[model samples]
Target chain A: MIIGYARVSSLDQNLERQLENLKTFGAEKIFTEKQSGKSIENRPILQKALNFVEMGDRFIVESIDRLGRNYNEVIHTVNYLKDKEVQLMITSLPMMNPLLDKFMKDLIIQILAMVSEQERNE
Target chain B: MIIGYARVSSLDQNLERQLENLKTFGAEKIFTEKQSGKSIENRPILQKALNFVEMGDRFIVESIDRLGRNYNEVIHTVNYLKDKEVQLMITSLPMMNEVTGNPLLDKFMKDLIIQILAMVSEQERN
Candidate 1:
């Protein structure tokens, strides 16, 4: 199953673009929420989306920031999915492949997380 | 005067885009370098640029990463320029203001992002 998650800050009031990207990426089930990314515990929808995925399932997001609001939270969420054996796919980074070695995969995720965090701060 | 600094890893072999952005942003004097961001002492060009800018001058970069290879170094560089009263401008974040308040929050956020980048680069080498 291909599951997706989308999020937008409360101030933005828009989740259309993220939803569109997830749909275009062939996400079969998409979960969305509009809330400030400052904290992860408050985003019950994201938690639900995380709980919904199982082993062998594909978890997709439009971008890394959609996974969490900050660097540590993003890393934690990615590791959570990894431990669950979910196939994590990022729409913005189409070149990322599940076949890469563990180090390379993690490096890419860290880079994306850094970029995402920077964007949020700005 | 608007002073610009552009950097690229020796492996990338391209600095045109950064140069173009700095030029388009009205940088009158630009410094260019091809070096690894892992160490500050090795990048003489960046040091020269830092030394050249004075109070009230604008120091610009295409992106934050160009400022340093890691978090601490970038923050140090920023503070160094800040102490000199240079107006730091990032082309990528045109909306950012030099006079913004809440220095604690701003510094914390910037520190977090750069720390992540530093971790990424360190892991990439491993």
Candidate 2:
């Protein structure tokens, strides 16, 4: 299934554009929330969407930033979806590769790994 | 003057501990909000507190987590306060600078800020 995920930074913000885009992309199921993209910890819909995916499922988002607020979180999320064998499609950044090593080359993934390993040490 | 900012994850949580600590620490002014720490945009009091600070002012919070949920946001806030020459007092992480210097925390602070900064810089790229 082509699953869609949408988010807004605040409760008052509209989700129509994202919802419409997800529909245009032929998403079978779409999840959305009126929450910040700063962190995914509290987003119930995002959590559910992740858990709802099956192998080879395509996950769609309006953009990469919709997945996270920073490189660390975005890359980590992308990696998790990759591990699940889920194809991620960022409608804005079309033709995006699911692999980090292939996405931004290697700099972002290295920095992300460095931070993740270091955070564990802390 | 000493300014205090306190936040809780949800509406049902109590603010007594945070309020008491800020009061005991001699906070001349205190602002409290009950909301998710996920984003700074949603916290008006935090923005007000930031704008209200003067060069010599100090801002107090219960912990680093009081500012935001992720490393990127917390460090971004810390840097903002640092740039204003505002001393940040985190009661739990009392010796903040010293503890932050510990390799594990240091790397996170440095990387987190850089990533968020990069994200904003590349905001229009994609």
Candidate 3:
């Protein structure tokens, strides 16, 4: 299943833009949520989407923050998809594809890790 | 020491309440932000506290979201202190500590999770 998830903090926020993208990306089914990402576990369609995806399927999001604002939980979600052999893809962040190139992905991780180390010096 | 850091999203938010609590808790040095928690890039006082902490030191915050709105960046911030050997001190998220006595495989799993989470967060920002 090529599932596309669209999320925004407010109902007044438009999903039309996201919808067009999801359609263009050929999302078979789409889920939309209206709420701040601060409360993701409370998101119904999102939870169901996670449970609904199966092996050899794929999940796409307009962005990751649509996933959540917390680091551990979002990472935990990725592990869930990856463990199931369901591919994870971000419509944004071009180079983040883990399946891209082994050396490149590892290098980027090291760079981000080091950048994080430098943030603490502040 | 239970060093506390408090911050507001903008310059107008009064911090007397947080400052008082940090002082009551004996925060050796506290950092205050007059801006949003979107990123730590522009925070001066936060930098001071982080840089001041040494081995066995503990860094405190009001909460995890208080650290950042960006998911990937916040985890990086946590690991930053972890690498420095400082314990994270959050008022609400008690579980926001580094894994101790874990195997190498566990560490790898955690890293992979963090990266994936970060990808989502950064993409969301875009």
Candidate 4:
């Protein structure tokens, strides 16, 4: 199953664009939240999605930033899914390979997290 | 003495940049954090500043985000300083006047201002 998760900073936001894209990409079911990714508990959908995944199921997001407010949190979430044997499909950064070194991926994550953090500060 | 606080996401993150930024801005003494701004009472430097702040002192930060991940948390820090009559200068948005803003940021900042005010109000109420 392709479990989808979409989040926006506030409940007033309309996540139609993300939801539509997830549907087009063939998400079997989707979960969404109005809370900011600054913290995970803000997302009950994430908790529900985490429980729903099976051995071969995948988690999908439009982009990494959509996953969280910064790189550290996003990486933490992805690493969690890996432990559960769930894969991530960041639509924008598609085509992940196991050949990549952990440190390199960690560094890249840090860079993106910095960028995302900068965006939020504004 | 001018006191400064510098916080990073983790201990490994070099606070040098923020420290330099603070000193460059003329912070006489500085405080820094190596943890997320999830809670105010947990920040050692913020607590230090609370203990250190005196009349005419100022608190500073890299920006609003560097201060905390949430608006409410940052404004609470500002209010803490204000109670001691210490001025705050967030280097990034230094010019921001809590008194007014466009409707969006206004609602957040105003909400925070009132949360602090109400804390005082409730203190009085009690």
Candidate 5:
């Protein structure tokens, strides 16, 4: 199944563009929500999408950065889906496959991890 | 003057605790608002606080990290206050100085902040 997901940080902002993007890309169904990107804990639609999909399912999004509010969560979300055999097709970050390039992936994760470490220190 | 400032990223969250902390630290008055610390443009209270203080005036906050909602903003806010000759005190961060630019005091405060931050790192790990 080809599934798409969309999100906006607040209720005021429209989720139309993202929904349209997902639709144009031929998503069989789309899930969306209005919530803070800070934590994935309360986002029900996102959790449902994860649970709804099966192995060999294709998952699509408008932007991967928008997928998770922070870098750690972004990397974790991507890794979890990868391990589950879900294929992510991010619209903006073309040719950016963290799964395919282990070296680059490690470097990004290291850099982002370091940044987060400094943040925690403050 | 003893001035207090508090910030929260969104309206959904309460700023009560931060306000209480500032009050306990002896802030005579406070400037507060609901907005992200990502940029200074939207934070009118922060701007007001910057303009409200004088050379000898003191600024107090619950945590210095709360200044900008992020590390860079925190650094920027501190730097701005440092150059302004106003005193800054971070209550939660013990032993933080009255302000920056005294050279000796600034150095000591940074050292203590670093130490406390290291403690925080360990806490996160555990």
Candidate 6:
């Protein structure tokens, strides 16, 4: 199953772009939220999305920024998916290589996660 | 008057995007640097940009990360310019481009975003 999650920083901002992208990526179910990206604690929709995925499911997002507002939160969420045996896919990042070693993949995700947090700050 | 500052972490990287954006934003003068962002002490061009601004002048940058590599350094630089009464224009952040007409609210917003940027840079370095 393909599960998608989308988010916008404010109520006024439209989530159309993210929704379209996720649909194009073949997301079977997409969870969305419109709220401040300042913290993950208040985002109950995201929590629901996280809980919806199961082992062997593919979880997709338009970008890493949709995952969390900060570096630690993003990393924690990524680890949570990893622990659950779910596949994580970020559209903005290059497709993951099945043959790539674990260390390299982890390094790339960390760098991208930092970039996402920086962009959220902007 | 508008003054712009641009920087890259290494010599191989290009500053064309930042330079073009700054130029298009009506910067009268721009300081460009090709150096590591690990420390502010080595960035003489940034220092020059800081020294070039005066009260009532608008200082511009493509983004907050261009301000500094770490949180404390960025905060110090921002506070330094704030004391000089120079206006800061960050192209990527809409809130920073225009004031809310409330001085306290504007300061709070700026401080909040700056703190977030600082934390991101610190995590990147570590």
Top candidate on TM-score is: 6
Per-residue accuracy of model 2 over B1-126 as CA lDDT, tens digit each: 899899997657668977898788778898888877767888898999988988999998876567666443555566577668888776655554444455644545554444443344223223
Error of 4 at A13 (Å): 5.2
Better of 4 and 6 by TM-score: 6
- Give the per-residue lDDT digits (tens) of candidate 2, residues A53-98: 9998999888665666554556557656866888877776565422
Model 6 sits at a Cα RMSD from the real structure of 14.4
**Cα lDDT computed for each candidate against the true fold:** 0.75, 0.69, 0.65, 0.66, 0.66, 0.76
Colliding residue pairs in candidate 2:
none
A6-119: candidate 3 lDDT, tens digit per residue: 888776767798888777877988988787665456788888999989899988887666666544455556656756887777676444343226334443534443343334
**Candidate 4 runs further than 4 Å off:** A10-14, A96-98, A101-107, B1-126
Candidate 2 positional error at B7, Å: 51
**Which segments of model 3 are wrong by more than 4 Å?**
A94-122, B1-126
Clash count (model 2, backbone only)? 0
Instruction: Flag regions of model 1 displaced more than 4 Å.
Output: A11-14, A96-101, B1-126
The fraction of reference interface contacts (C-alpha pairs within 8 A across chains A and B) present in each candidate is 0.00, 0.00, 0.00, 0.00, 0.00, 0.00
B1-126, model 3: which lDDT tens digit per residue?
667788876657657866775666457777776767667778767777788888888887765555665654566676778678887765543443455654433455455554454445444544
Instruction: Give the runs in model 5 whose Cα sits over 4 Å from its true position.
Output: A1-122, B98-126
Tens-place lDDT digits, model 6, residues B1-126:
789998888656668877998888788899988876677888888888899999999898887777776655675687677768898778777566477675433544565576667556655765
True contacts kept of 4: 0.00
Can you write out model 5's per-residue Cα lDDT over B21-105, one digit (the tens) per residue?
8888888989987776566777778888889998888888776446654432454466456567777787886455545565433
Please tell me how candidate 6 rates in CAPRI terms: incorrect
TM-score of each predicted structure versus truth: 0.47, 0.41, 0.43, 0.44, 0.42, 0.49
How well does candidate 4 score on lDDT at residue A32?
Answer: 75
lDDT of 4 by residue, A13-111 (tens): 668888998988888788877777776776777878878987888899887778887544565676667667787677666656222243334345545
The residue pairs found clashing in candidate 5 are none
Return the DockQ of model 1: 0.02
* A1-122: candidate 6 lDDT, tens digit per residue: 99998888776666788899999988988888877666788888888888999999999998877777566567668767876889988887746622224434655676676666666556
